[PDB]
Design a protein around this ligand. Structure first.
Ligand SMILES: *C(=O)N1C[C@H](NOS(=O)(=O)O)CC[C@H]1C(N)=O
Length: 250
């Protein structure tokens, strides 16, 4: 366990980072207090909800559809019968809400327990209804479910090292749709952003969680901001993450 200083890459934004290589068990941690603090995963939960949907047969491939019903949305790309691959990359909330609402709560509880997914608290299934957004809500979006950056990395490692019961075929679908283009062919980067605002503490929950492959070595990582500036989003934290990878993990 090395405590490290990635602060230059955060360019003044409050946050932390953790990178873990399970072959030689080197944990690199920036801002240990934050890295151990549980927070809502927001859209990073789509990593796990994709696997849940595949395991239960709600979806079957990166092509699979959820039966778009014509509802109007402001994001152009949500207004179509999009595939799993597209819904993941667009972070399409209606697709993943429809997916998860086809699965019984006990099945979800037992999967989260098996993954040690933070507090595994799905008690507020419908999510943070006080924000007014109705069905565009769920337990994983600033609601009952909370996970620390360290636990995210531990979960990613268990999934992608083959240490869960999820089918290898399903793991590989998730790998395919998480792949990121970082304009450097010598590293393979995979991940998912997440964006929320913690109304109680007036801080963002801005995430980028995933994995890095670089010549035999694999690092599992989680980068997280808790800044008070509402302009700090998951996509912004992904840029920070990419800068860290390029500076320190190349
Ligand atoms: C997930 O966090 N959400 C869905 C969507 N994706 O955000 S991302 O660009 O950080 O991946 C928008 C924000 C958020 C939500 N409000 O539901």
């Amino acid at each position: 366990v090395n405590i490290v200083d990635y602060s230059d890459c955060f360019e003044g934004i409050s946050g932390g980072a953790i990178f873990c290589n399970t072959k030689n068990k080197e944990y690199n941690i920036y801002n240990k207090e934050l890295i151990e603090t549980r927070r809502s995963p927001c859209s990073t939960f789509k990593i796990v909800s994709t696997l849940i949907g595949l395991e239960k047969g709600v979806i079957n491939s990166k092509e699979s559809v959820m039966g778009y019903d014509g509802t109007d949305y402001p994001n152009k790309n949500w207004n179509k019968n999009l595939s799993l691959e597209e819904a993941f990359k667009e972070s399409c909330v209606w697709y993943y809400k429809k997916l998860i609402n086809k699965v019984d709560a006990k099945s979800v509880q037992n999967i989260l327990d098996d993954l040690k997914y933070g507090n595994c608290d799905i008690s507020e299934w419908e999510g943070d209804l006080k924000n007014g957004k109705g069905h565009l809500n769920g337990f994983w979006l600033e609601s009952s479910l909370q996970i620390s950056p360290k636990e995210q990395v531990q979960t990613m490692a268990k999934i992608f090292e083959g240490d869960t019961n999820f089918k290898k075929e399903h793991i590989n679908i998730l790998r395919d749709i998480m792949a990121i283009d970082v304009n450097d062919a010598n590293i393979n980067v995979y991940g998912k952003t997440g964006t929320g605002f913690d109304e109680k503490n007036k801080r963002v929950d801005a995430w980028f969680v995933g994995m890095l492959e670089r010549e035999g070595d694999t690092y599992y990582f989680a980068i997280k901001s808790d800044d008070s500036n509402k302009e700090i989003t998951g996509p912004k934290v992904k840029e920070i993450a990419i800068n860290i990878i390029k500076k320190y993990y190349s």
